[PDB]
Amino acid sequence: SKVCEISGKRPIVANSIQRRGKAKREGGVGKKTTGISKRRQYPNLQKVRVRVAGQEITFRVAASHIPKVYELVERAKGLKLEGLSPKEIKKELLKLL
Amino acid sequence: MKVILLEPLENLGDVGQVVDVKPGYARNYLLPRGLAVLATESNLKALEARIRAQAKRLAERKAEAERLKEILENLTLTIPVRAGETKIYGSVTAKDIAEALSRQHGVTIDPKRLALEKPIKELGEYVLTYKPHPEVPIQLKVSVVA
Amino acid sequence: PKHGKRYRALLEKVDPNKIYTIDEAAHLVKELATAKFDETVEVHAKLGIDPRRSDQNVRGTVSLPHGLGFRNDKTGAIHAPVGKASFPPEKLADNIRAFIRALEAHKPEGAKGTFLRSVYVTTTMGPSVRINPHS
RNA sequence: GGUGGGGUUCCCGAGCGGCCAAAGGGAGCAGACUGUAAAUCUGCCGUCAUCGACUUCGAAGGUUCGAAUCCUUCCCCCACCACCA
RNA sequence: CGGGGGGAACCUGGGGAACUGAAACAUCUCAGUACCCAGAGGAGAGGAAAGAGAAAUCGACUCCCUGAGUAGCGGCGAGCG
RNA sequence: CUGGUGUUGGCUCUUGGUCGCGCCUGCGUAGGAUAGGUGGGAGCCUGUGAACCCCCGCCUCCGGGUGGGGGGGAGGCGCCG
RNA sequence: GGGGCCUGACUGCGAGGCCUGCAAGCCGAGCAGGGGCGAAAGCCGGGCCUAGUGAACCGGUGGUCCCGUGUGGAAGGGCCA
Ligand SMILES: [Mg+2]
Ligand SMILES: [Mg+2]
Ligand SMILES: [Mg+2]
Ligand SMILES: [Mg+2]
Ligand SMILES: [Mg+2]
Ligand SMILES: [Mg+2]
Ligand SMILES: [Mg+2]
Ligand SMILES: [Mg+2]
Ligand SMILES: [Mg+2]
Ligand SMILES: [Mg+2]
Ligand SMILES: [Mg+2]
Ligand SMILES: [Mg+2]
Ligand SMILES: [Mg+2]
Ligand SMILES: [Mg+2]
Ligand SMILES: [Mg+2]
Ligand SMILES: [Mg+2]
Ligand SMILES: [Mg+2]
Ligand SMILES: [Mg+2]
Ligand SMILES: [Mg+2]
Ligand SMILES: [Mg+2]
Ligand SMILES: [Mg+2]
Ligand SMILES: [Mg+2]
Ligand SMILES: [Mg+2]
Ligand SMILES: [Mg+2]
Ligand SMILES: [Mg+2]
Ligand SMILES: [Mg+2]
Ligand SMILES: [Mg+2]
Ligand SMILES: [Mg+2]
Ligand SMILES: [Mg+2]
Ligand SMILES: [Mg+2]
Ligand SMILES: [Mg+2]
Ligand SMILES: [Mg+2]
Ligand SMILES: [Mg+2]
């Protein structure tokens, strides 16, 4: 779980290519690969603490989607309860569909 | 990053203004302190709503202000007093002038909005000035044998 | 003041921010002569050449259409007389368009960048009028 | 192959447009000083040579009134970068 | 109210080798194979054009034949396609 | 290990770049010259306050260049040499 | 060995052979064009001769015009050096 609770962005697998030599575009013979290996790219995940009802609610988010967390507190009506949750905010309050 | 201000901020802006600020400043200072709120079209609409309900009910003030003003520049209020001559034994105070409307001509004024500043003694042609916000002079003459 | 009030009067007539047409210029240059005898009108241009080089020079001879009645210096600017301030507004416009298209001819190959970078129509004693040499 | 540097009196070396024989250091020659060697100090020092005159600054040309300076090119060195089927 | 666990193979998705080939070997091959994990279900997937691609052209997706070992791709090698 | 950039904000002082606009910048005694270049130019500038002493800035080949307020109250440059 | 003219250390090709596993290497009359030396016959496609050399791939550079992903271009290739 290095994963966005808003976007769902999760780490991905990317090759890493070691290239040598002069571009053909620059009048070289063109590039060579001296290696390819796997690696992950992570989402740039950050904490967002937010106060909703009387409660302090913490999202793990891609920095990309940090705004959405604040649009998500902007629909706040029916929870005087607890914990927990809510995070009843969450998916249902995201696109609802 | 655009934000609606909920209090005057000593530059930045003052209340209700839309000023555009660094998202860091916005998210970790302004918003959580209630000093601002987001410039969302939903909340840019709420402002625009409440921008209209001010300058409406402020033309409600001026509604019945320059309304009433235009009825009271066309009226003269005559009050009889037991005057002897040019010194009233009694006096006419603001609250009196008030009753002198509610009775004679059937109109009501504050009186606390009159600007008499100590009661009328003696007599003559009087012009005082009334309120709230741009407003009317009333003309009343204090007369004799009550 | 660095200029007499005679000139100071002329400094309120021109917004140098505006890029004028020659037609805007040739007419507005008549208000630009307060001198008690007849002024001479000049067209100046800073050029797209490096003069320090032998082959980047601009010079020739010109006979102006409306008659009298050019070479670049070492800093790459250039100056010649187009006529007199007595000439009619239309008799200036044709003498301005005479010098403009006269210089364009002489452009050296090694000229790097635009040939007319700035063109100011002035008078002998007058202020600078920033104009569009292409209009 | 590229970019940045350079070239100067015997070695070095600054070096400027308002002219710089062109600062200075050293070497060299002649002078004083002398235990030795040196240090210090004086003139010589591109050259003819009499003030002064005449070349000269990598090279050729060019700008300009004016070139050891600015410019185009050539040339060689320094340096760094990159590339190689 | 629902889930949970199981199922020969088949399916999708998340991950993912190496021997080997290149008569050495590193890009490349083997191969998105083996294998691990999650899930679906009698199938699964895909699917109703922000498609093709040269014609005023076709008309969702899947599957077979063909196009074709073509077009390409390639230490322009092995080979892939 | 490290530059940029995301998370990442308030207030400042300090600079470098460039573009623009305003303003000064410059000397061989030699032209009386203490002249940056090239146009146009014998004429402007001025008692909307000049030459000039007086404080004052900054520059300086230290001669002057040279602005800031004014006392000052008509002259001062140029062709002409 | 010396001297006078010149630059064929040409372009387009090439009968036919030497050699030879392949690939290569070698010699070459003769035609065409345009030349050079000679009065001319003629000679000249480097040097008395046999070593002074390196497939293909990938790129550089100058051409030319051949291809130019719907069309004109361009990008990028090809061809020749
Ligand atoms: Mg990488
Ligand atoms: Mg945070
Ligand atoms: Mg993003
Ligand atoms: Mg973003
Ligand atoms: Mg930001
Ligand atoms: Mg001795
Ligand atoms: Mg002795
Ligand atoms: Mg089930
Ligand atoms: Mg199951
Ligand atoms: Mg998979
Ligand atoms: Mg998964
Ligand atoms: Mg799999
Ligand atoms: Mg392997
Ligand atoms: Mg192996
Ligand atoms: Mg092998
Ligand atoms: Mg093998
Ligand atoms: Mg082995
Ligand atoms: Mg594969
Ligand atoms: Mg299962
Ligand atoms: Mg199905
Ligand atoms: Mg289905
Ligand atoms: Mg589906
Ligand atoms: Mg494959
Ligand atoms: Mg000058
Ligand atoms: Mg043969
Ligand atoms: Mg012939
Ligand atoms: Mg002959
Ligand atoms: Mg032959
Ligand atoms: Mg190969
Ligand atoms: Mg074509
Ligand atoms: Mg296309
Ligand atoms: Mg096309
Ligand atoms: Mg091409």
Nucleic strand G within 7 A of Cβ A31? no
Q: Please tell me the distance from the alpha carbon of residue B115 to that of residue B129, in angstroms, as a whole number.
A: 7
Name the CATH superfamily, with its identifier, for domain C15-66+70-135: Ribosomal protein L1/L10, rRNA-binding domain (3.30.190.20)
Q: Are B32 and B6 in contact (CB under 8 A)?
A: no
- Quick one: tokens of B44? 């840019």
CA C75 to the chain's CA centroid: 16
Number of alpha carbons in the 13 Å side-chain half-sphere of residue B124 = 8
Q: Please tell me the distance from the alpha carbon of residue B146 to that of residue B127, in angstroms, as a whole number.
A: 21
- Burial string for B27-42 (b: 16+ CB within 10 Å, else e) reads beebbeeeebbbbeee
The one-character DSSP state at B104 is: T
CA distances from C70 to B56, B104, C45, C80, C107 (A): 72, 96, 12, 5, 13
Test A66 with B27 for CB contact under 8 angstroms. yes
Resolution in A: 3.1
Distance, CA of C50 to C1' of F43, in Å: 35
Strands C129-132 and C116-123: antiparallel
Please give the sequence-ordered ranges of beta strands (E in DSSP) within chain B, or none if there are none: 2-5, 18-20, 36-38, 76-81, 124-129, 137-144
Sequence spans of domains, chain C: 15-66+70-135
Q: Are A31 and A20 in contact (CB under 8 A)?
A: yes
Q: For residue C129, what are the β-bridge partners?
A: C121
Q: Please tell me the distance from the alpha carbon of residue A51 to that of residue A58, in angstroms, as a whole number.
A: 9
Q: Please tell me the distance from the alpha carbon of residue C119 to that of residue C43, in angstroms, as a whole number.
A: 7
Distance, CA of C112 to C1' of G70, in Å: 39
Q: Please tell me the distance from the alpha carbon of residue B135 to that of residue B62, in angstroms, as a whole number.
A: 9
- Quick one: tokens of A76? 């706040």
Q: Are B123 and B83 in contact (CB under 8 A)?
A: yes
- Quick one: tokens of A91? 């998916």
